[PDB]
Amino acid sequence: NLLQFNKMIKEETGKNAIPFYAFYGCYCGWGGQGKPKDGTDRCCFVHDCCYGRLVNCNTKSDIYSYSLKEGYITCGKGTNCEEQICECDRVAAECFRRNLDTYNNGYMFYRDSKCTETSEEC
């Protein structure tokens, strides 16, 4: 569920998913195409690929079980979908943290029109 994913982002980066990551670069937020602009933007690209692999799961609304086991976001046991969706979310949240150093505010609100290039492959 996006609201849980949102919580992970805040927990991992200290920032709010909105608007810091809802419209960043070419892949963060709705849509996505062209090539990732930077580390951060790549995190979003991969997450998309991740969700792409779950063709039959309600990736955005399915509520899963997870928890901060010793300051570590750990996915709980549920259905294949929940466990899979949670992992995508888990990895993305942390990828954002690892890329905080190259986070560019100039990429926040990046026009999708400026993302014209052969969109990358998963």
| Interface with Ca ion (CB under 5 A) | 27, 32, 48, 62-63
- With respect to Ca ion, which residue has the nearer C-beta, 70 or 115? 115
List beta partners, residue 66. 75
- Does the annotation place 106 within a ligand binding site? no
The verdict on whether 101 is a catalytic residue reads no
- With respect to Ca ion, which residue has the nearer C-beta, 37 or 70? 37
- With respect to Ca ion, which residue has the nearer C-beta, 27 or 66? 27
**How far lies 64's CA from each of 21, 25, 43, 119, in Å?**
21, 28, 21, 31
Length, in residues, of the chain:
122
Q: Is-cis flag, bond preceding 19, omega within 30?
A: yes
The verdict on whether 62 is a catalytic residue reads no
E strand or H helix that includes residue 41:
helix 39-52
Question: How many Å apart are CA 52 and CA 73, to the nearest integer?
Answer: 22
Q: Which residue is nearest to Ca ion (CB)?
A: 32
Catalytic residue among 38, 41, 47, 62: 47
- Does the annotation place 52 within a ligand binding site? no
Q: Which residues are catalytic?
A: 47, 89
Binding site, annotated residues for Ca(2+) = 27, 29, 31, 48
Binding site, annotated residues = 27, 29, 31, 48
